[PDB]
């Protein structure tokens, strides 16, 4: 339920996904990240829990070329680096 402020590179990704706010909950941040991956079709077409984020700004933040939605720790580690707790 805590409010967070994304750092600029993360906020840019959320903005592409349609976010107009500057303060979010963690769940809302995760929501817009999924929206971004979906709109850009970064998920693997055959095994859709795999996300291929290499060569995309999201991969620069996550620091991995791909991840599994079922092994979300790279996402959470990125959030710790990119969220200011308010």
């Amino acid at each position: 339920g805590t409010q967070v402020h994304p750092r600029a590179p993360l906020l840019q990704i959320l903005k592409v996904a349609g976010a107009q706010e500057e303060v979010f909950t963690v769940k809302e941040v995760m929501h817009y990240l999924g929206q971004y991956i979906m709109m850009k079709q970064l998920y693997d077409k055959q095994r859709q829990h795999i996300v291929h984020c290499h060569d995309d700004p999201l991969g620069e933040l996550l620091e991995v070329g791909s991840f599994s939605v079922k092994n979300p720790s790279p996402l959470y580690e990125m959030l710790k680096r990119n969220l200011v707790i308010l």
């Binding site: 999924g34 979906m38 859709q48 939605v69």
Partner: peptide
């Protein structure tokens, strides 16, 4: 499942 379904499962956990 679809990506939307997998992400919704993850989202619920946050």
């Amino acid at each position: 499942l679809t990506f939307x379904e997998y992400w919704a499962q993850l989202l619920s956990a946050a």
